[PDB]
UniProtKB/Swiss-Prot annotation, chain A:
Phosphothreonine carried by residues: T422, T451
Keywords annotated in UniProt: Acetylation, ATP-binding, Chaperone, Cytoplasm, Disease variant, Disulfide bond, Hydrolase, Intellectual disability, Isopeptide bond, Nucleotide-binding, Phosphoprotein, Ubl conjugation
CDD domains: TCP1_gamma
Residues engaged in binding ATP: G34, G86, T87, T88, G403, G474, E489
Protein name: T-complex protein 1 subunit gamma
Phylogenetic lineage: Eukaryota, Metazoa, Chordata, Craniata, Vertebrata
Region (Disordered): 1-16
Signal as UniProt keyword: no
Predominant location category: cytoplasm
Oligomeric and partner information: Component of the chaperonin-containing T-complex (TRiC), a hexadecamer composed of two identical back-to-back stacked rings enclosing a protein folding chamber. Each ring is made up of eight different subunits: TCP1/CCT1, CCT2, CCT3, CCT4, CCT5, CCT6A/CCT6, CCT7, CCT8. Interacts with PACRG. Interacts with DNAAF4. Interacts with DLEC1.
Post-translational modification N6-acetyllysine, affected residues: K214
KW Nucleotide-binding (keyword) present: yes
Known function: Component of the chaperonin-containing T-complex (TRiC), a molecular chaperone complex that assists the folding of actin, tubulin and other proteins upon ATP hydrolysis. The TRiC complex mediates the folding of WRAP53/TCAB1, thereby regulating telomere maintenance. As part of the TRiC complex may play a role in the assembly of BBSome, a complex involved in ciliogenesis regulating transports vesicles to the cilia.
S-S bridge residues: C358-C364
Swiss-Prot record, chain D:
Assembly and oligomerization: Component of the chaperonin-containing T-complex (TRiC), a hexadecamer composed of two identical back-to-back stacked rings enclosing a protein folding chamber. Each ring is made up of eight different subunits: TCP1/CCT1, CCT2, CCT3, CCT4, CCT5, CCT6A/CCT6, CCT7, CCT8. Interacts with PACRG.
Coverage span on the entire protein: 4 to 107 of 531
Modified positions (N6-acetyllysine) in chain numbering: K2
Family, per entry: Belongs to the TCP-1 chaperonin family.
Residues bound to Mg(2+): D87
UniProt name for this protein: T-complex protein 1 subunit zeta
Compartment list: Cytoplasm
Taxonomic superkingdom: Eukaryota
Associated pathology: De novo genetic variants in nearly every subunit of the TRiC complex, including CCT6A, have been found in individuals with a broad spectrum of brain malformations, and clinical phenotypes ranging from mild to severe epilepsy, developmental delay, intellectual disability, ataxia, and other features of cerebral malfunction.
Swiss-Prot record, chain F:
Disease annotated for this entry: De novo genetic variants in nearly every subunit of the TRiC complex, including CCT8, have been found in individuals with a broad spectrum of brain malformations, and clinical phenotypes ranging from mild to severe epilepsy, developmental delay, intellectual disability, ataxia, and other features of cerebral malfunction.
Residue positions, PTM Phosphoserine: S21
Function: Component of the chaperonin-containing T-complex (TRiC), a molecular chaperone complex that assists the folding of actin, tubulin and other proteins upon ATP hydrolysis. The TRiC complex mediates the folding of WRAP53/TCAB1, thereby regulating telomere maintenance. As part of the TRiC complex may play a role in the assembly of BBSome, a complex involved in ciliogenesis regulating transports vesicles to the cilia.
Name recorded for this polypeptide: T-complex protein 1 subunit theta
Positions of Mg(2+) binding: D97
Residues binding ATP: G98
Residues the entry annotates as binding ADP: Y45, G46, G98
Subcellular location: Cytoplasm; Cytoplasm, Cytoskeleton, Microtubule organizing center, Centrosome; Cytoplasm, Cytoskeleton, Cilium basal body
Family: Belongs to the TCP-1 chaperonin family.
Record-listed Phosphotyrosine modification sites: Y28
UniProtKB/Swiss-Prot annotation, chain G:
Associated pathology: De novo genetic variants in nearly every subunit of the TRiC complex, including CCT7, have been found in individuals with a broad spectrum of brain malformations, and clinical phenotypes ranging from mild to severe epilepsy, developmental delay, intellectual disability, ataxia, and other features of cerebral malfunction.
Residues at which ADP binds: G37
Record protein name field: T-complex protein 1 subunit eta
Subcellular location: Cytoplasm
Record function comment: Component of the chaperonin-containing T-complex (TRiC), a molecular chaperone complex that assists the folding of actin, tubulin and other proteins upon ATP hydrolysis. The TRiC complex mediates the folding of WRAP53/TCAB1, thereby regulating telomere maintenance.
Source organism, top-level taxon: Eukaryota
Protein family (similarity comment): Belongs to the TCP-1 chaperonin family.
Signal peptide (UniProt feature, chain positions): none
Species this protein is from: Homo sapiens (Human)
Self-association and partners: Component of the chaperonin-containing T-complex (TRiC), a hexadecamer composed of two identical back-to-back stacked rings enclosing a protein folding chamber. Each ring is made up of eight different subunits: TCP1/CCT1, CCT2, CCT3, CCT4, CCT5, CCT6A/CCT6, CCT7, CCT8. Interacts with PACRG. Interacts with DLEC1.
Amino acid sequence: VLSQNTKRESGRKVQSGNINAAKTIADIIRTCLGPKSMMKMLLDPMGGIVMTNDGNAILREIQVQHPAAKSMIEISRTQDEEVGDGTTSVIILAGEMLSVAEHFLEQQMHPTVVISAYRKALDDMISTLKKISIPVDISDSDMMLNIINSSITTKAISRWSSLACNIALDAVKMVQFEENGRKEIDIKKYARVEKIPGGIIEDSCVLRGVMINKDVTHPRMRRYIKNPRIVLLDSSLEYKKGESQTDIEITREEDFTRILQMEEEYIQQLCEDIIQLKPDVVITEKGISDLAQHYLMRANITAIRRVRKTDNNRIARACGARIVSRPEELREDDVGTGAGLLEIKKIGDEYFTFITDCKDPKACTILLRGASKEILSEVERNLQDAMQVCRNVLLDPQLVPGGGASEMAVAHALTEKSKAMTGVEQWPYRAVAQALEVIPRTLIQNCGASTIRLLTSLRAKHTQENCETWGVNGETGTLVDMKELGIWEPLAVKLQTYKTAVETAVLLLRIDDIVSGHKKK
Amino acid sequence: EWNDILRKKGILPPKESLKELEEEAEEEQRILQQSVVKTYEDMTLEELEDHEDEFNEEDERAIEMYRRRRLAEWKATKLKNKFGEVLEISGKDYVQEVTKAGEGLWVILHLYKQGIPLCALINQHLSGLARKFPDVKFIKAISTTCIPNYPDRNLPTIFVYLEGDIKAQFIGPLVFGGMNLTRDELEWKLSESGAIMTDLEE
Amino acid sequence: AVKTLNPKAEVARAQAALAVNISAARGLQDVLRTNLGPKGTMKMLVSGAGDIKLTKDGNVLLHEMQIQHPTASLIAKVATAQDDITGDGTTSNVLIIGELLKQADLYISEGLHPRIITEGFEAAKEKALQFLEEVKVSREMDRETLIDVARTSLRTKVHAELADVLTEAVVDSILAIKKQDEPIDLFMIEIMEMKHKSETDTSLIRGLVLDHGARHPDMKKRVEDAYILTCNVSLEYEKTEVNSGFFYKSAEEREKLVKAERKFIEDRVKKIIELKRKVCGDSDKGFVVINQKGIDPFSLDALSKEGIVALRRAKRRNMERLTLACGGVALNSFDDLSPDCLGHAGLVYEYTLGEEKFTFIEKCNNPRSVTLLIKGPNKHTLTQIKDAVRDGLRAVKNAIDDGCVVPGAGAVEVAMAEALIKHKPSVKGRAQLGVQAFADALLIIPKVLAQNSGFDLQETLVKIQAEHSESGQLVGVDLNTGEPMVAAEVGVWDNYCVKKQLLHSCTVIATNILLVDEIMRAGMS
Amino acid sequence: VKTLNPKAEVARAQAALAVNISAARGLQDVLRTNLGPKGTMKMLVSGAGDIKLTKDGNVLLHEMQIQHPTASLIAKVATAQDDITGDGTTSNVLIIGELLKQAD
Amino acid sequence: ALHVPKAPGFAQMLKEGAKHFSGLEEAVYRNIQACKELAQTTRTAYGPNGMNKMVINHLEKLFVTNDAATILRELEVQHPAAKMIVMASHMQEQEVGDGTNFVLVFAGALLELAEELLRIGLSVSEVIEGYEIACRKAHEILPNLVCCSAKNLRDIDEVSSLLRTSIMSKQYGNEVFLAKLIAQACVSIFPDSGHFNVDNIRVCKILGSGISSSSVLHGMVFKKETEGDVTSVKDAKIAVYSCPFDGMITETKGTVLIKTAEELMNFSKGEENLMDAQVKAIADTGANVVVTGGKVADMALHYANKYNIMLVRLNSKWDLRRLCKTVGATALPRLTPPVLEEMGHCDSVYLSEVGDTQVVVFKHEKEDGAISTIVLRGSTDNLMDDIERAVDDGVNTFKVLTRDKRLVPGGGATEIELAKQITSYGETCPGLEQYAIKKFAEAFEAIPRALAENSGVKANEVISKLYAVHQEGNKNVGLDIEAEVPAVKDMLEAGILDTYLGKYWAIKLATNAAVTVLRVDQIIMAKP
Amino acid sequence: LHVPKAPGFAQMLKEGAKHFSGLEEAVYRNIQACKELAQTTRTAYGPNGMNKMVINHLEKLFVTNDAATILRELEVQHPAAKMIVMASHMQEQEVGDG
Amino acid sequence: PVILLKEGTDSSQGIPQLVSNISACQVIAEAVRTTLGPRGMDKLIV
């Protein structure tokens, strides 16, 4: 028969559990968006201490028994990887609109017509969003700082935006590059995020160069150079142990001292081959013996070893240099230049190499002076979001007004097209359209001010044109035009949020059977 | 209510018990998590070659002491690497190595008749093992000259001796039968004899 | 809520979150107000093993008490970052944060959603920061300035006579520095830990002191004048890296192979002693060789057959120390040799401390590396003195960095209080309320000092505030009779940038604490 | 004083003060919502599966499973007040707890 | 770096057995959802298309119950709001009796609409007055919807049709047979100036053949066999006795004192002769049966044999009281013969066999009496229980009809009428309370949807048709769930009726339960 | 007969965490413990200084009249005892008698 | 939250139960599927 510990359930209870868990999870992270946001705290299963207010970064930190919540977490990380902001937005949209679907499901409905209503609904509202799409040129720095401040308005570090926002844009350009003249690339892995504890927020900014937490490898080397000569090697200077085994049979009177002489001579010849194209700094990820450094002290090289592989990539990209593997292949074109300034400064109680670029960089490294690793992590996540949106606007010069007004605008548009169409799916259609504006009521709750009157006035104002930009002012719980407030969000972000929430709803509204307790095979 | 009043007075129902087992198990589970960092500096012998990713401070007292113990360990282990070729001694001397073979040194006393892929593959596996463990005395020979008219249906028989005491036995192919038998399984069996400490899946 | 999904989920509501955070912070501030100031209590923190440490330092106080609260964890983290950056008055940080949250509690007790208070605190912080920029006074560093700065900032974590002797020793300490280079860092100065004698014997050494003594009973116990050979060359025996062995037919062949084995150490030793003699060795011209690698007893005896001085296995930073103390150029191979690499030392001797034998090098002409020696009754006192000297040198560095010293002992914060009160009817609204308490925030700093002194709080407080209000100057707190009197005139200051960073961090952590809405233990399902 | 009887709870001055303050805070904050023609309506469940709907303070005090010195004093005083006058007894506890909070 | 402790205050004092919920976003919603699903539990069936729900109690009695009142009596629930709702239904059944599930579904619809509106963002008070205004509007408008009034409660087919409506909510195969039986029983005892009582009707279940072989009996039937050697008497004279039938034993220890032989000699003789004198005096009244409840003496039985006297012994004081009520006899405290005025007279008494079960029967051929019982034949006890509760619903219907004759047609017509008129009224109110009026109106639209679902019929068509008909001008037209296809017809001509009082009490108790639920804001649960 | 402990410092301790505060707890307790320890060995190091013996965990016997060894082998759970024995040890490292 | 009814209930419904009813009855009949009829069989139960 069937095995013992396998429980199998069906009927209404499974969808009941699904919708209840969906609304539950949506009812734990509601109050974190808009200017009025309330800063959450959570503890990792390990025992760490974190605090954040953006969705998936913390929703990754929950273990659950029910499957639907794991599906929710996967949706959250999908949104995190795709857009990096408004993570809570898609979650709450999915939860509220599933809640709307629930009541309708109770009333004799079957999921086939429901999912058909989703497909037609999403098609219609995406088309409407295309209609209301307006492009704006991306060549203005003031625009980009405005959008960064709009995004960070949901974040508590908005205080320093005046400087901080600008910092973001800097990286977005000073890493920007294109392979062979095409396929423009902006690598965040090349935008290494380093944070030095202590210091005010203002002292933190992007440096037109590369930052590494290392120091000098020998006291008697210069600790400052204006223009060093850059070479990168990927082989150790210590004796290489070959591949096979020989076990030399010392038969004659003496070969051991001869062996040591040959060893030091090989080291000498390779080191002098390196010196042949006179450098000023040699950098390598491998360890180095004393003899190579001693030989380099005649050439006064900086002699830095044991660097990180991605750090090698970043430094090479910034300098524009190349990477060698043999001293013998050393040639001219590989040695890049652009090291406008080099320092080894003692910061706090740790050393850091300060190479400052003079020429064009194609990779950035960040100094982050703060008060604690958790706050620095917060600002790092938020600046990552900043460059994310900056590059998103770079790729697509589209904008629509922020503050959630477009939700109600497209809701009214779908209302009119539901009037145009004929069917019974118009009911769930308009219902999920009403689910769309869960955001503004959430914003009002964050404000804690009057709700119904402003909601109704907003609703009346948006059923006609000329008000689509006009939105909800969360600063003081009022209604204003967004042509002047400044909150503006890219088209692709809201596109992805809409698609993600709708597809999650479509996924969660098909199951009929659950079987639990089976074994991996 | 009534049950807990019972509990204060009597023990006729059991329901408050066994809630300490999982408690202690979780306590030990959290406790055993510091063993990874307790011996981080106490296991690797290449950490000196791991400069610039292992150094934060050098107290030069216990750490030079660690070099001293490490070098003593290394010299002790590499002074014993003397083997690696399975050897064919004759039956005339046999009494002199069944007994005079050194105390504290394991002896894998292999007996065989060449010709069957069973014995040939076993000889191959042990010879290859000699390349890995040169601290183990391997012996191979023809059992006929070791034991007179030995039954040829009882080969290859593995013998494990030390100080004339049989510690492990593996008699005939009844425990090695099959060309599918491999390197690691032989090493596993000899480890199970108590001579070697390694790890294997099965 | 999510507790339905996870039966093992601990959930604390927003009000519950605030309540627990406030309880934690109140406990922290109540136990910490016992610490700061030269009158703060000194505690016993003992681990399970019995390791005992007696301290007035807030950070080590944090890290050897039994802590349990995630909010308390964050408090300790930020306070530790502050101690890392400067290490002084760390208790002030956490006391400020706790009492800010307390006043926020007093006001939230009347509704009054706290984000308004956060923004009002930001504005008041900005205004007070400008006020601080105004109020600070600049005087270029000198004997009196630095000695008084050290004598004042030192007692936050250590007692009086030690403070005086430490001030004298540290005045003698930061003089081997460059004129305008700022060469000061912990990498360059060293601290000796030796349980030898009482506290009245601690001093400083411009030269260098090493814990390694003679490897052989023929060495020299004292060298009048020495020429230093720092080397980074392997002198001990080594194996050929291809594992070569000896194959011969005769025992005399074995002898010849032994000679072949030894020839390389022989010619290295030959080169070294030849350079030694060529420079000179005659007529009490001592020679010292400094290696960080092993030495064979063969090499040991070969070099010591003529009574040279040479040792082994010092700290890797000691090679920098010696380059900037003896002056001789370091080396890694004898491919190139010249007497330029020779260092100089004006006096070398030894003194065996118990089981351990010590060497001392001194009489350095231009010492750029100096070391500190401290001898105390036992381990706990020496750890405490080490922490105290570390923080004191931190304070000396902070003072000599800039040329602005702010007055201390309670004047500047009451000044900020009155100035913020003046600015308050300009903050535009109920945020003034918060700003009000925000002023009351700084109110704690001499209050705690008044609390520690045993004087009744409100009377001395209103005395101080009236003294500042009537005048425009900065009046300090008396710690002998409580009578208000300005403090900058007796040599009392505090680090300007330190208080800047302090206020920054305190405000940031205060808003982070106050903005919490949900406390979870998600996981372990 | 855990030596004369090893099993005995001994709390010093601040300990007693703090526990009294915390209990009073909890009680007063709970009872804020139970006065006026627009107070919040409380539902209670006895130790049998029987439900009582109350707005009375003394009922709430003597239906809560609360084991505490100050809470006991509160229950007794409110019982006497309900016996004698029996109206707006909420005011009693509110005044007492608020004065406690002030003097704190 | 450990688990979050408890806050100083409430979190240090809510006992381990004590739990608390505060704030409707986490406290009240639990109650709302609990009651919604509890209603859904019985929402599966009522009326013409109900289905029996076999339930087993913790006492291991198998209750095959489709009566929502009996269901809830069997149900054991531990949610306090569920206790509120179930007691509300209990008092409702006490006042009216039939269709207790209607109150359940109405309260569930009201509570789900309440959850919806309060999730929108409303406050408690304004919407409370909204429901209350809608309720009083119903209070006044429902009497306007009273269509007819029952007349004279006497014609047998009249009362049969009147009660077959409430019976039809029960067993559906054929109610008209049970209608005939219940009408025959009830009309026979029609009070003139007194008050009709349910104790005036008795019940006699008998395991046996199909229910069709059952009838009614004007009188009483009991599970006893007479000690009398005679069995059948017609126009017997009944001497009811309340005293123990032995020689009356004095309340104090009475001791025989014998001195001489003759005292022993005459003792038994005089004793039996005195006993014979008493029984002869009793016989002189002309009695043909003797009824007593106390302990009986054999000498009396032998004497009765000597006079050919029927003897019957009962065992319940209820039996004696009801017998005196139906025959007019009296509870005699002494064995002395009564007078003709205080005795009961019966047309015929038998020990009649009823299917291999023997019972003492008191039958009046005039069939007037004062109490009538029903003979029941069924293959199982649970069938007896179900039919018995159906007859309970019918008799409660009749008894409330005697107290109030105004009629309302059941089914679905009145529900849509009330909903439509409440909506139209809500079109005419200003302020923040019209939404509550509309929600109150749409609360009892579940009744049409419930009928549509439990009849296995799509509900959008039927609700649209109902609203179209109600807007057309037809006001007595409701659902039709016998054709098993969306269609409507007027309940008035369908015989499906009801009384204004039942519906009135139902709605008023439903809204009282709702307002009690909604006002409550804090929850403190004690230990199970 | 129900009373909890004060929230705050008494509630942020570990389960095994113990504490003594003020003149009451910390001061009287350590003073009495130190007096106990001093009185234990207060009958030796004299012309008549009476030697005292002890057995260790290592099951080795020791008959000593100089407090050094007997205290160094003895173990305590009182931190002030650690302080006084470390003071004696420092004396020993200085001279090593009395 | 808190559960509606007391613990220890069971709730299976639908066609599952209906089928699960009929089958049970069947069992009993096949236990006695040979007795009546002038052939006649006999059981034994202890």
